Amino acid sequence: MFSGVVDIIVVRQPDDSLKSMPFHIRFGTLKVLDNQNINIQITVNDKKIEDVFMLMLPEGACYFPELNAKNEIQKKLRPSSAILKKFNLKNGYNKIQFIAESDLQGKQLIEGKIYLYNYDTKLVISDVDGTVTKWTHDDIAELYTNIQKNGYKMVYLSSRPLYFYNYTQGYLKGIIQNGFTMPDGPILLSPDQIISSLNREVVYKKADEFKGALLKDLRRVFPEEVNPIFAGFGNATACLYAGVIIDNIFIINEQSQVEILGKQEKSSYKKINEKIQELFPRLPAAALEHHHHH
């Protein structure tokens, strides 16, 4: 029944090509009389994108048809670099709209967020439930704000059912703590919550493995030479194996006590923020860009 777009992440590669994570979109309130007559068009930052379209399976999952060498059509959740370049994305947040039309009248519109990162961007992962929520932990909005001000990008992770996705986005946007708000960033969704025929290879993972796979997939959109995930906040093997050093894995408990793994330091969001230059050292070029957009 979901209508919407799971936030999309696109990364520019050192050779100028673009790669993205999967496009997960649904038109849950559209009655589809015949899926083969559906075509989906794309508008980015209020500009229609020419010569790009998506198709829809009988089950409602949407994909990019792309010819392989055999002139066979492959059904792709991840569009080609050539297609992504037609979007004319800017660094950071971009508005994206998908419009499902048929041979008949009536067009279904959904709106999402698509983020563009350069390959040298440094990401800071945060769980939502239990890490942002306890009710919201104290001092988290000031810390995350100052992480973002030092040039890092907050990336949120959720494993709630798709039903709650737009609510989780509203929750994060509504936090305010002493004037501080949560930095805008993408919310990635555990893949077991958005299974279709297009990503069903997923189903041969055990339930415990989905976060780790998600973080490896996030890393894979970056080039082999870089290490993009700088730190992670949770409530650990998943961060470690996706390239987070153990000192940068922050695990909060019941009591709002934060354990800095591998230092076995017991700390807080307030105290991490006090030592922000030591733990999240300023990234000069990346910080300048954030400052001059905000």
Author numbering: 20 to 153, 168 to 268, 273 to 331
The authors write:
Lipin/Pah phosphatidic acid phosphatases (PAPs) are Mg2+-dependent enzymes that catalyze the dephosphorylation of phosphatidic acid (PA) to produce diacylglycerol. pmcLipin/Pah phosphatidic acid phosphatases (PAPs) are magnesium-dependent enzymes that are evolutionarily conserved from yeast to humans. They catalyze the penultimate step of triacylglycerol synthesis, through the conversion of phosphatidic acid (PA) to diacylglycerol (DAG). Structurally, all lipin/Pah PAPs contain highly conserved N-Lip and C-Lip regions that combine to form two domains: an immunoglobulin-like (Ig-like) domain and a HAD-like catalytic domain.
Structure 1 was determined using a Δhelix-His construct that lacked the N-terminal helix but included a C-terminal His-tag. The Δhelix-His structure represented an inactive state due to covalent modification of Cys276 by cacodylate, which was present in the crystallization solution. Cacodylate modification of Cys276, which lies below the nucleophilic Asp of the DxDxT motif, induced a major rearrangement of active site loops and residues, including an Asn residue (N268) that binds Mg2+, the adjacent Arg residue (R269) we implicate in PA recognition below, and an Asp residue (D272) that is mutated to His or Asn in rhabdomyolysis, which formed a hydrogen bond with a Mg2+ bound water in other active states of catalysis. In sharp contrast, in the Δhelix-His structure (Structure 1), cap region 2 formed an upward facing alpha helix that was continuous with the prior helix and would be perpendicular to the membrane interface. This unique conformation was formed through crystal contacts, with the continuous alpha helix packing into the active site of an adjacent molecule. We thus consider this conformation of cap region 2 to be an artifact of crystallization and represent a catalytically incompetent state. However, it does highlight the flexibility of cap region 2, which may be important for the regulation of lipin/Pah PAP activity.
